[PDB]
From a paper:
In heterotrophic bacteria that use alginates as crucial nutrients, alginate lyases depolymerize alginate into alginate oligosaccharides (AOSs) and then into monomers for assimilation into the central metabolism. The overall structures of these [name] alginate lyases are similar, showing a β-jelly roll fold composed of two antiparallel β-sheets with a deep cleft. The noteworthy structural differences among the solved [name] structures are the loops around the deep cleft, which are variable in length and sequence and involved in alginate substrate binding with the deep cleft. Structural study on several [name] alginate lyases reveals that two loops around the substrate binding cleft determine product distribution.
To explore the structural elements that affect product distribution and hence Dp specificity, alginate lyases that would be suitable for comparison analysis were first screened. [name] is a [name] [name] identified in this study that preferentially degrades polyM when presented with alginate, polyG and polyM as substrates (the detailed enzymatic properties of [name] are presented in Supplementary Fig. 1a). [name] mainly degrades polyM into trisaccharides, with a trisaccharide content of approximately 82.9%. To obtain information about the substrate binding cleft of [name], the oligomeric substrate M8 (MMMMMMMM) was cocrystallized with inactive [name] mutants. Unfortunately, no sugar unit was observed in the structures of the AlyVQ139A-, AlyVH141N- and AlyVY261F-M8 complexes, and only two sugar units were observed in the structure of the AlyVR91A-M8 complex, which was attributed to the minor residual catalytic activity of the [name] mutants. The crystal structure of the AlyVR91A-M8 complex was solved at 1.90 Å, showing the typical β-jelly roll fold with two sugar units bound at subsites -1 and -2. -2 subsite: The side chain of Lys209 formed two hydrogen bonds with the hydroxyl groups at the C-2 and C-3 positions. -1 subsite: The side chain of Tyr207 formed two hydrogen bonds with the C-5 carboxyl group, and the side chain of His162 formed one hydrogen bond with the C-5 carboxyl group. For [name], the corresponding two peptides linking the four β-strands were composed of residues Pro117 to Ala134 and residues Val183 to Leu210; thus, the structures of the two peptides of [name] showed long loop insertions with small helices. The length of loop1 from [name] was longer than that from PyAly. More interestingly, Lys131 from [name] loop1 formed hydrophobic contacts with the sugar unit at subsite -2, whereas PyAly loop1 was too short to form any interactions with the sugar unit at this subsite.
Residue numbers in the entry: 39 to 302
The structure:
């Protein structure tokens, strides 16, 4: 039933420019495993990363709080260039995500992240693609998440946007500040599909973050405050809930560099 994603033409392009980071839910190493660090995914099939032969879905699957199975796209890109927009396209079906979160500990821990724009560190700093370095702050620019319930909305996708470039980590000395208390916009994108897939396109460039869902722009947000941070894409599952396992089927996942975003 399970095959190597590298065998499937529709995923080959994105995999050539990615590595896989995958937690080991019962491993005792305490740091995630990493694979295809050279962008070569031949032979890679795991419980947490495979193609389902029948549907040809790329499956990311992961038990346990804060664990993840995700590809990390190589390019550390600048978000402030005119006419250069970095684009992550995905067509996904989350698999019974309400079941995944059903045994969680508290209402806030009821989320699953599918797509991210994270920072690698400063545009000022000389470190290569594919890794992180000086200037890194421990917050992604945006996560597209499923949330079971928020603000009366049940089973919607949300964009969790970091709305400043401040380090608000536990060792920052900043957690009490206004910037840190008010650091995020959490904005509702669309309910999860009743049937079929949900199509996402993220464009980052020209000092903008654009997020489309089913070809309709849901987020169109100036990100000039982030433009000192080299940024990069991740896609898969990453768990903000306890005591279960998440699963997402990606029927398409693409990465490209465009002269302009699609705004509609
Ligand atoms: O749950 C929280 O205390 C805050 O989480 C923040 O998102 C975290 C996220 O859960 C992962 O740890 C992540 O990738 O790092 C994130 C970050 O932005 O630092 C935000 O959701 C924040 O609103 C929460 O209060």
């Amino acid at each position: 039933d399970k095959a190597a994603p590298a065998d499937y033409e529709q995923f080959q392009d994105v995999l050539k420019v990615s590595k896989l980071q995958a937690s080991d839910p019962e491993g005792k190493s305490g740091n995630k495993s990493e694979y295809a660090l050279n962008g070569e995914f031949d032979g890679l099939v795991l419980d947490s990363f495979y193609v389902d032969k029948a549907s040809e879905a790329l499956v990311f699957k992961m038990p346990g709080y804060k664990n993840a199975s995700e590809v990390r796209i190589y390019k550390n890109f600048n978000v402030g260039e005119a006419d250069k927009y970095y684009h992550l396209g995905a067509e996904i079906k989350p698999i019974n995500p309400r079941a995944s979160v059903a045994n969680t500990d508290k209402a806030k821990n009821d989320a699953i992240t599918y797509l991210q724009v994270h920072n690698a560190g400063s545009v000022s700093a000389d470190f290569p693609d594919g890794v992180s370095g000086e200037g890194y702050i421990p917050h992604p620019l945006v996560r597209v998440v499923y949330e079971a319930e928020r603000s009366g909305k049940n089973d919607w996708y949300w964009a969790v946007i970091k709305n400043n470039a401040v380090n608000c980590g536990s060792k920052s000395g900043n957690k009490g500040t206004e910037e840190c208390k008010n650091a995020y916009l959490k904005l509702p994108i669309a309910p999860i599909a009743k049937e079929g897939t949900d199509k996402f396109d993220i464009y980052v460039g020209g000092n903008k973050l654009i997020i489309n869902h089913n070809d309709k722009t849901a987020i169109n947000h100036d990100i000039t405050y982030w433009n000192e941070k080299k940024s990069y894409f991740k896609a898969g599952v990453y768990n903000q809930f306890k005591n279960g396992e998440s699963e997402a089927h990606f029927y398409k996942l693409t990465y490209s560099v465009e002269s302009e975003p699609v705004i509609r």
